[PDB]
Design a protein around this ligand. Structure first.
Ligand SMILES: [Zn+2]
Ligand SMILES: [Zn+2]
Lengths: 172, 165
């Protein structure tokens, strides 16, 4: 399985959706990201499953540092991706599956929530959950999601989704 | 040798309960009215107080219901409230999930005082709303064992713990 499929499958990455390879392959979609993550070249290669460099001698491995970079880069791409009609389509799918959890308010009656970020700057805050019914923001019940940066989901995702799919917005 | 009460409050899922003072239970005046709500009231009250005892499990079930009803009244008394306030300070009931409530500890609360109506819920004193416990281990604890007015009783007796919202 692809790096992306492998990543989105890990424990804690349930909120993520699989970004279409072609979206990533189009340089125009990643403009600006390459200057936010270290080892951008090797990291983007790892995400797309390509020959992982030469790698010769004592040359300290710095391997893990690249794995982390791929992780950050995938996140930033994810953020942009889920604003596009295709990404939104995929998230809407998970939404229908309750992939993001249900609102804990007793009166929201288990309204499924959408992931959301309190900030678009990486390292600011971890991902939170937005209930479209009571329109408030909650902390995920599972600690497994307490290390997922919210910037990988953005502050305007939930808004975008309902803008494109008004029919799913809770009534009254 | 652990007392029935100590044993009960120690079971998985009964973390929201506090241990009712034996003497409170021994005073007949405090239980007036309860004896006509649970079956086998005599044997059940005996089991709760650790006294000389197929219909067995049915009595264990009765002691469980009876302890709950007593708990409900108990936590309205200054002594019960004191104990609950303790657990409250330990975050024994959990913290509010609202991101902006900033992990405000919550108090248990019932949506109804009638047994069998609804399971126990959590009241955040900051956003003043009611939530369902994150852990499924608490999804079988009747809310009637905590009452609809407990949280409000606690803060009337301890206004100083009223969060600045
Ligand atoms: Zn809600
Ligand atoms: Zn709250």
């Amino acid at each position: 399985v692809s790096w992306i499929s492998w990543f989105c499958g890990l424990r804690g990455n349930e909120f993520f959706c699989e970004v279409d390879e072609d979206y990533i392959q189009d340089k125009f979609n990643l403009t600006g990201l390459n200057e936010q993550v270290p080892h951008y070249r090797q990291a983007l290669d790892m995400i797309l499953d390509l020959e992982p460099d030469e790698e010769l001698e004592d040359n300290p491995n710095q391997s893990d540092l690249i794995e982390q970079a791929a992780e950050m880069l995938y996140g930033l791409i994810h953020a942009r991706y889920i604003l596009t009609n295709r990404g939104i389509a995929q998230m809407l799918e998970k939404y229908q599956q309750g992939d993001f959890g249900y609102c804990p308010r007793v009166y929201c009656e288990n309204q499924p929530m959408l992931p959301i970020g309190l900030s678009d700057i990486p390292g600011e805050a971890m991902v939170k959950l937005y209930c479209p019914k009571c329109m408030d923001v909650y902390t995920p019940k599972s600690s497994r999601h307490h290390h997922t940066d919210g910037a990988y989901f953005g502050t305007g995702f939930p808004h975008m989704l309902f803008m494109v799919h008004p029919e799913y917005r809770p009534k009254r």
